[PDB]
Amino acid sequence: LKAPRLYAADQWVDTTWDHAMALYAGLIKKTLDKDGPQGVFFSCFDHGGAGGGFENTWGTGKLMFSAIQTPMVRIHNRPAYNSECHATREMGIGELNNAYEDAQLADVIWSIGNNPYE
Amino acid sequence: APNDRITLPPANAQRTNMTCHFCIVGCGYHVYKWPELQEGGRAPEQNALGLDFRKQLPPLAVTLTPAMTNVVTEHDGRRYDIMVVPDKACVVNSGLSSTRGGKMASYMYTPTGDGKQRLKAPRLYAADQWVDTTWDHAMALYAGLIKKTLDKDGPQGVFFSCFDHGGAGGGFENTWGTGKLMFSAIQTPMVRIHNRPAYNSECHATREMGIGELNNAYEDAQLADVIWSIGNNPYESQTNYFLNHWLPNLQGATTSKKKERFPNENFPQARIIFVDPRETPSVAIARHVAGNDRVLHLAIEPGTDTALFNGLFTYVVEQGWIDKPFIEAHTKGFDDAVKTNRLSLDECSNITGVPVDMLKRAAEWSYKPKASGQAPRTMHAYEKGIIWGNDNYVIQSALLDLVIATHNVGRRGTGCVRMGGHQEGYTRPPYPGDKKIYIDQELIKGKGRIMTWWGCNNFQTSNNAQALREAILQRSAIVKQAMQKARGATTEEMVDVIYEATQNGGLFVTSINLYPTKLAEAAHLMLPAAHPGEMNLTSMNGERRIRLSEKFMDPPGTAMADCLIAARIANALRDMYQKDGKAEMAAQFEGFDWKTEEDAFNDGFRRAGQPGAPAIDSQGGSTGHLVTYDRLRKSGNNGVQLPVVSWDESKGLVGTEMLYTEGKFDTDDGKAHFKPAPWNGLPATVQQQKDKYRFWLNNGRNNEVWQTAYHDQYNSLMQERYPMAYIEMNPDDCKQLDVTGGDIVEVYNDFGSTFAMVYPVAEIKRGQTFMLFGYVNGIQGDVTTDWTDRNIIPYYKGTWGDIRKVGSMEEFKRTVSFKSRRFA
Amino acid sequence: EGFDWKTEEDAFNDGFRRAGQPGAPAIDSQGGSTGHLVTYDRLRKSGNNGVQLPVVSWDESKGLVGTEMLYTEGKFDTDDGKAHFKPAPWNGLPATVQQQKDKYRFWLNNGRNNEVWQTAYHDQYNSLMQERYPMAYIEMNPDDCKQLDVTGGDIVEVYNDFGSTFAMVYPVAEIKRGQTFMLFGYVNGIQGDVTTDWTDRNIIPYYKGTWGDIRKVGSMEEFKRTVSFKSRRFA
Ligand SMILES: Nc1nc2c(c(=O)[nH]1)N[C@H]1C(S)=C(S)[C@@H](COP(=O)(O)OP(=O)(O)OC[C@H]3O[C@@H](n4cnc5c(=O)[nH]c(N)nc54)[C@H](O)[C@@H]3O)O[C@H]1N2
Ligand SMILES: Nc1nc2c(c(=O)[nH]1)N[C@H]1C(S)=C(S)[C@@H](COP(=O)(O)OP(=O)(O)OC[C@H]3O[C@@H](n4cnc5c(=O)[nH]c(N)nc54)[C@H](O)[C@@H]3O)O[C@H]1N2
Ligand SMILES: Nc1nc2c(c(=O)[nH]1)N[C@H]1C(S)=C(S)[C@@H](COP(=O)(O)OP(=O)(O)OC[C@H]3O[C@@H](n4cnc5c(=O)[nH]c(N)nc54)[C@H](O)[C@@H]3O)O[C@H]1N2
Ligand code: F3S
Ligand SMILES: [Mo]
Ligand code: NA
Ligand SMILES: [O]
């Protein structure tokens, strides 16, 4: 993608960024003004690397949560605003608790629900 | 890859013949093919080009760029260099390559090149997603639906829009295969043509008057005193005819040859007259070449051609600048046409807007006797400005009347000819119905169970295209929704589900193509086809010169020649009918036992007019059987002009240079027939748009872009130059709308809405515009009307609309040239 | 053109009586296309009973004959003659209204009083009306009243993010805690100041959907002397 793309009713065309923002922000604004945030939905990455990361998760999160203030947000891999690791975290154990060096120091490695070579 | 060298073909490289894939002119090319890890040396005898690359080459020595090279990967996995370059010894082009034909190498299929997205296998929209499917399953579904439709609704339920043309995505094998399938086997009349919404001709009037539209040789353009280009932008649309034949005439390089043929005839400097509302690159280039004094631009009001030709005809008759012995011996209806078509110069001028002096001059140059006594040799060339003009049938009536009265058919250096679009390659059974049917209107109105687009894309190229797409997308959606409920169905059950959805407004859509295209937005089934070079293919150019394009590489995946796709469908349908114990229906699907494209050439072109043959309409005529692949190979890219007159092993194919030179026309009596040509103004549908909206929405070709840009859309240079369809606008009009080059506008009227990037052009008249037709980004046809002439020929050049600024595309400003395309 | 009218009957002829007639422009009329059967004189002869529209026939002997109930044949005013069901989503209160509810205490219900007509354009000049309702009133729950130290004839400000207005307090036992009812449209204390800008898809306001707070201004002794604050719910 090199420029904004618009489906103008019956065909794909290019459009300008200003037009795209007029249409997109205009709809969000209209929805906020008449329905409030509950009318504006997102499914958004929450991850790192390409298509994520600390800059990007902040930008999107600030936009969705602090500015628009919509709760109608799901995550790239799961259909609500939730965690993969509710239980371990609630038990007091955040899911990334070691180093890769620990895999070198182990007597035994369990690989559970996991195909790590691939 | 590296942009600063090329791999030369080895001295011993394989070399095959190829006609350009694209426009009517049909320039000759050679394809050099050799293993990837070999190359030629720079010394001239150590490369296949015979050129000396040990030092700089002079101008005209070669046409060679990286875009003219590629590396293909064949079905055996081995990689071969190819180089596709123009043939210096071909009479058509004399080693010229247009910017379009020049890219053929780049547009051959390779896994990583511009052809990367070529269709390689059947694609199925299985209700909610695109997947691959087998050929067997695809045929079971497609033939299964055709069979069910035939069984319950008859042929009237099976619709096609199919190419009827030559070159790539057409030609004699392919038009026969498709025509036999549609007309002799299925026997559906629900068939339109790639460029027009019924089963009709662009040239009903000239044909009915006895003058087939391709009646001369390209050499005639060299021998003419005067060339008319009517509704035609030939530098851009028939480049190498214009460059290699027309211009040499204007430059004086053909004067010797005229004088050698006609010892006692004056030949003044040649002149050129353009009848075109718009000042085009062709007009500008003609003026640079010949000077302003030898070019007449009759910048008529849109849609006024009939009035122009009636005024000219009236005048040459009143002046006596006609051939009375010719009229008396070889024509019928003259006296009647003088009365019906009478129009004064003053009235002509008022309607057309051309000043009287310019009308007189055009007549003086073209028809007033030369000092030596003979009439000028005036070749009248025309194309889509009048074929898609204000009443196709009447314009041609008006023009041909002028031509016949002035004896400008059948004499060397004359002709009243189509310039052409695609190449020609038609061999078909007769159309099986007795009426013209406006196919798009029928589809919009909810008729048909199954529609196949076959080597066309009317999403981009229909008239009133927005109405078409709206309807097809909706009808397509009904079928997708119905398919959605299925789980675990047999092919036969799925046929039933789809058939039922078509009783509820649905339409099953198939596309048979090189590429997905915009049709993929609605299609349920897409089948992969093969283009020239992946198959043998025959076709003829605008002077009827038939050539063989030789196969030299494999198609992508399981892509097939269109004629063999037609055989596949026929044989599927036959098996289904045999299996259902229906011997009589099965037999309708006989005659497709084909292994190779040559089988289709033998069954079609070469059977026409032969004993015990069915009725066959063929541009080859009844001597078509004298042409074989082997004989065409021996002819080379010079081929033969059709019809063939004789053949023997020692003299090869000998054909026909010019038609009608004995004064016998294609009518019952052998005479040419004049016709009345009434001036009725614009059609009401079009006049209403003109009354409501500001801009004439002229449309047509750009030199660099081929058609619906099915290849060019993947070419990074093409997309950088023309990222969006452009609209030429007068600069004063631009300032009024606060737009400049690289802004995006909406163009709209009562028929639809589309978009374009603004291209200020000083030469465009106030209140007129010109938009690129057919493109992938901003479809022009949305704003064309539904209006057609008596034979369902659209007035594609006849529409008006308003223009609204969307915004400035800064990226276009930074990357696209908005500089003048009119050379001076 | 088309306003050469000397009397109101001219406008009846030009409008109601032309609807659906030959050569007539497009006209939307509750009379329908049989409107031309109605004339002043025929209405006079009908008396105060008139005729239920649409008129189905007329003649001098039977007068206007009209339509009692619509849709008794099962043919509805749609393309296909059927009645069409529609989806009806529950989305709670509009955000704009919910925000006032979240910020403020009282549901500010509003509407009619039996004795008062509309914006009181006549009633404001009527000395009996003005004695009985000198100021717009607000029905309040008596327990809510005690909490705010107000009784009948006190003056309160009613306000929220949209505006501020005033009312005289009318304790009403039947009002629910947290709810109120103020006379709308009135000449002394305009209720609409505190209604929101929110409308449905066709710009229909939720006039009955607003919340606000209530603040005592003071005791209007004159209202206490002259106005009944007795119950308007008959038993
Ligand atoms: N407004 C407006 N509309 C016009 C015109 C105009 O002047 N104004 N011009 C009209 C004219 S003259 C024409 S020719 C039409 C063009 O209308 P179309 O025929 O719809 O357009 P093309 O680009 O020629 O379509 C060729 C299609 O076939 C595919 N293809 C190419 N090679 C092959 C092959 O070997 N096999 C198969 N099966 N498919 C192949 C391409 O990928 C592409 O999708 O548009 C017409 N429409
Ligand atoms: N570069 C390139 N060349 C091609 C093609 C392509 O896509 N690209 N397509 C090919 C095909 S399939 C075809 S059909 C041909 C078409 O080739 P042409 O017909 O030459 O090209 P067009 O641009 O469609 O239109 C020709 C001219 O008609 C003029 N015109 C418009 N309205 C009228 C009118 O009322 N009267 C008259 N007298 N003139 C009018 C326009 O101003 C335009 O200059 O080109 C072929 N060659
Ligand atoms: N005395 C008198 N009669 C009049 C008028 C007048 O000014 N004075 N005006 C006339 C006019 S123009 C009109 S429009 C009519 C109006 O006549 P009605 O609509 O009957 O009267 P209102 O008092 O506007 O409101 C009706 C009821 O709506 C209830 N209500 C409030 N919110 C809701 C809600 O969310 N849901 C439900 N289901 N009920 C709710 C209120 O408690 C109230 O009793 O009266 C007409 N008649
Ligand atoms: S190179 Fe091709 S596009 Fe036409 S002018 Fe020649 S046949
Ligand atoms: Mo064409
Ligand atoms: Na559109
Ligand atoms: O064409």
Question: DSSP of B684-705, one letter per residue?
Answer: HHHHHHHHH-SEEEEEE--SS-
Q: Is the CB of B28 under 6 A from ligand 2?
A: no
Residue C55, SS3 per DSSP: coil
Q: Ligand 7 center to residue B422 CA distance, Å?
A: 6
Looking at the DSSP bridge assignments, the partners of residue B515 are none
Cβ neighbours, 10 Å, residue B485: 9
Backbone φ and ψ for B22, nearest 5 degrees, come out as -105, -105
- Burial zone of C90 (CB within 10 Å; 0-12 exposed, 13-18 middle, 19+ buried): exposed
DSSP-derived pairing of the beta strands B28-35 and B69-73: unpaired
Q: CA–CA separation, B548 vs B480, rounded Å?
A: 42
Strands (E), chain C: 57-59, 63-65, 106-111, 137-140, 154-159, 164-171, 179-183, 211-219
| Active site annotation includes B349 | no
- Cβ–Cβ below 8 Å for A19 and B806: yes
Compute the Cα dihedral for B234, B240, B241, B246 and give only its sign: positive
Q: A14-38: string of b/e by CB count within 10 Å (b at 16+)?
A: bbbeebbeeeeeeebeebbebebbb
- Cβ–Cβ below 8 Å for A16 and B806: yes
**Protein residues with CB under 6 Å of any ligand 1 atom:** B 168-169, 194-195, 384, 388, 421, 454-458, 461, 512-515, 517, 529, 531, 562, 699-700, 707-708, 710, 773-774, 780-781, 784, 796
Q: In what order do the strands lie in the sheet with B640-641?
A: B537-540, B545-549, B640-641
Q: CA–CA separation, B89 vs B635, rounded Å?
A: 12
In terms of C-beta distances under 8 Å and separation of at least 24 residues, what long-range contacts does B349-354 make, across chains too?
A: B349/B311, B351/B301, B351/B304, B351/B307, B351/B679, B352/B298, B352/B300, B352/B301, B352/B304, B352/B307, B352/B308, B352/B311, B353/B299, B353/B300, B353/B301, B353/B304, B354/B298, B354/B299, B354/B300, B354/B308
Cβ neighbours, 10 Å, residue C82: 10
Q: Which residues contact B238 (CB under 8 A, 6 or more apart)?
A: B23, B24, B25, B232, B383, B419, B420, B542
Q: CA–CA separation, B366 vs B228, rounded Å?
A: 9
Q: Which residues does chain A have within 8 Å of residue B771's beta carbon, measured at their own beta carbons?
A: none
| Active site annotation includes B94 | no
Q: CA–CA separation, B692 vs B315, rounded Å?
A: 36
Residue with tokens 């505006």: C163
Q: CA–CA separation, B808 vs B145, rounded Å?
A: 49
Q: Which residues contact C68 (CB under 8 A, 6 or more apart)?
A: C52
Q: CA–CA separation, B442 vs B451, rounded Å?
A: 11
Q: For the CA atoms of B8, B12, B14, B17, what is the dihedral angle to 10 degrees?
A: 80
Residue with tokens 């030609």: B171
Identify the CA nearest to C151 among candidates C66, C84, C224.
Answer: C224
C→A contacts (Cβ < 8 Å), by residue, are: 91, 94-96, 98, 198-199
Q: Residue ranges of the alpha helices (H) in B266-340?
A: 281-290, 305-319, 324-330, 334-340
Residue with tokens 């400008």: B408
The ligand 3 atom at the shortest distance from the C-alpha of residue C115 is 1
Cβ neighbours, 10 Å, residue B292: 10
Q: Are B627 and B606 in contact (CB under 8 A)?
A: yes
- Cβ–Cβ below 8 Å for C98 and A36: yes
Q: How many residues in total does chain B contain?
A: 824
Q: Which of A10, A11, A16 is facing B808, going by the closest CB pair? A: A16
Chains A and C touch each other (3 or more Cβ pairs < 8 A): yes
Give the DSSP H or E segment for B525. Answer: strand B525-528
Q: Probe ligand 2: pick from B107, B229, B237, max atoms within 8 Å of CB?
A: B237
Cβ neighbours, 10 Å, residue C229: 16
Q: Which residues does chain A have within 8 Å of residue C91's beta carbon, measured at their own beta carbons?
A: 35, 38
Crossing angle between the packed helical segments B562-579 and B135-153, to the nearest 10 degrees: 60
Cα end-to-end span (Å), chain A: 30
Q: CA–CA separation, B751 vs B466, rounded Å?
A: 7
| Active site annotation includes B98 | yes
| Active site annotation includes B23 | yes
Closest C-chain CA to A33? C96
CA angle centred on C65, ends C63 and C71, rounded to 5°: 175
Task: Report how far Cα B173 is from the mean position of its chain's Cα atoms.
Answer: 17
**DSSP letters for B68-115:** GEEEEE-TTS-EEEEEEEE-TT-TTTTT---TTGGGHHHHS--SSSTT
Q: Which residues does chain A have within 8 Å of residue C199's beta carbon, measured at their own beta carbons?
A: 34
- Cβ–Cβ below 8 Å for C94 and A37: no
- Burial zone of B687 (CB within 10 Å; 0-12 exposed, 13-18 middle, 19+ buried): middle
- Burial zone of C148 (CB within 10 Å; 0-12 exposed, 13-18 middle, 19+ buried): middle
Task: Report how far Cα B475 is from the mean position of its chain's Cα atoms.
Answer: 29
Please write down the HEC assignment for all residues of B505-523: CCCEEEEEECCCCHHHHCC
Token pair for B29: 């090319």
Is B734 annotated among the ligand-binding residues? no
**DSSP letters for B206-226:** HHHHT--S--S-THHHHH-SE
Q: CA–CA separation, B465 vs B433, rounded Å?
A: 25
Residue with tokens 């209007």: C220
Residue with tokens 């068939």: B191
Cα–Cα distances in angstroms (integers) from residue B458 to residues A116, B201, B466, B477, B480, in the given order: 50, 18, 10, 18, 21
Q: CA–CA separation, A96 vs C180, rounded Å?
A: 56
Strands (E), B610-752: 617-618, 640-641, 646-648, 652-654, 672-673, 695-700, 726-729, 743-748
Looking at the DSSP bridge assignments, the partners of residue B652 are B648
Q: B255-288: string of b/e by CB count within 10 Å (b at 16+)?
A: beebeeebeebebeebbbbbbbbbbbbbbbbbbe
Q: Probe ligand 1: pick from B514, B702, B770, max atoms within 8 Å of CB?
A: B514
Residue with tokens 């090199």: A2
Q: For the CA atoms of B21, B22, B27, B29, what is the dihedral angle to 10 degrees?
A: -30
Closest A-chain CA to B808? A16
Strands (E), B195-270: 226-230
**Protein residues with CB under 6 Å of any ligand 3 atom:** C 109, 111-112, 114, 116-118, 208
CA atoms within 13 A on the CB side of B735: 5
Chains A and B touch each other (3 or more Cβ pairs < 8 A): yes
Q: Are B92 and B541 in contact (CB under 8 A)?
A: yes
Identify the CA nearest to B118 among candidates B710, B515, B554, B561.
Answer: B515
Cα end-to-end span (Å), chain C: 60
Q: CA–CA separation, A19 vs A6, rounded Å?
A: 10
Helix, strand, coil in percent for chain A, rounding step 5: 40, 10, 50
Q: Ligand 2 center to residue B389 CA distance, Å?
A: 11
Q: Are B485 and B454 in contact (CB under 8 A)?
A: no
Q: CA–CA separation, B365 vs B493, rounded Å?
A: 71
CA angle centred on B809, ends B806 and B810, rounded to 5°: 145
Identify the CA nearest to B309 among candidates B209, B408, B202, B395.
Answer: B395
Task: Tell me which chains share at least 3 CB pairs under 8 Å with chain B.
Answer: A
Looking at the DSSP bridge assignments, the partners of residue B149 are none
Q: CA–CA separation, B812 vs B742, rounded Å?
A: 5
Q: CA–CA separation, B135 vs B155, rounded Å?
A: 24
Q: Is the CB of B25 under 6 A from ligand 4?
A: yes
Instruction: Look at phi and psi of residue B558 and say left if phi exceeds 0, alpha if psi is from -120 to 50, else beta.
Output: alpha
Identify the CA nearest to B405 among candidates B483, B488, B341.
Answer: B341
Q: CA–CA separation, B219 vs B824, rounded Å?
A: 28
Q: Which of B753, B778, B807 is facing A18, going by the closest CB pair? A: B807
Q: Ligand 3 center to residue C112 CA distance, Å?
A: 6
Q: CA–CA separation, A78 vs C22, rounded Å?
A: 64
Compute the Cα dihedral for B48, B50, B56, B59 and give only its sign: negative
Cα–Cα distances in angstroms (integers) from residue B627 to residues B611, B642, C22, in the given order: 17, 10, 72
Cα–Cα distances in angstroms (integers) from residue C34 to residues C38, C49, C81, in the given order: 8, 18, 20
CA angle centred on B68, ends B163 and B194, rounded to 5°: 10
Chains B and C touch each other (3 or more Cβ pairs < 8 A): no
Identify the CA nearest to B467 among candidates B749, B44, B111, B674.
Answer: B749
Identify the CA nearest to B69 among candidates B55, B48, B93.
Answer: B48
Q: Residue ranges of the alpha helices (H) in A1-118?
A: 17-34, 54-61, 86-90, 101-105
Identify the CA nearest to B700 among candidates B26, B237, B20, B306.
Answer: B237
CA angle centred on C63, ends C59 and C67, rounded to 5°: 105
How far does the CA of residue A30 sit from the closest CA of chain C (Å)? 12
Backbone φ and ψ for B574, nearest 5 degrees, come out as -60, -50
Residue type, B689: Q
Q: For the CA atoms of B695, B701, B705, B711, what is the dihedral angle to 10 degrees?
A: 100
Residue type, B185: A
Strands (E), B142-270: 158-162, 191-193, 226-230
How far does the CA of residue A17 sit from the closest CA of chain B (Å)? 8
Q: Are B275 and B385 in contact (CB under 8 A)?
A: yes
Backbone φ and ψ for B681, nearest 5 degrees, come out as 70, -165
Q: CA–CA separation, C167 vs C226, rounded Å?
A: 16
Give the DSSP H or E segment for B17. Answer: strand B14-19
Q: CA–CA separation, B88 vs B103, rounded Å?
A: 17
How far does the CA of residue C154 sit from the closest CA of chain A (Å)? 37
How far does the CA of residue C213 sit from the closest CA of chain A (Å)? 23
Identify the CA nearest to B22 among candidates B748, B697, B525, B701.
Answer: B701
Identify the CA nearest to A8 among candidates B757, B476, B777.
Answer: B777
Cα–Cα distances in angstroms (integers) from residue B270 to residues A48, B248, C96, in the given order: 72, 10, 80
Q: Is the CB of B700 under 6 A from ligand 7?
A: no
Q: CA–CA separation, B174 vs B596, rounded Å?
A: 11
**DSSP letters for C162-224:** S-EEEEEEEE-TTSPTTEEEEE-S-SSS-GGGGS-S-B-TTS-B-TT--EEEEEEEEE-HHHH
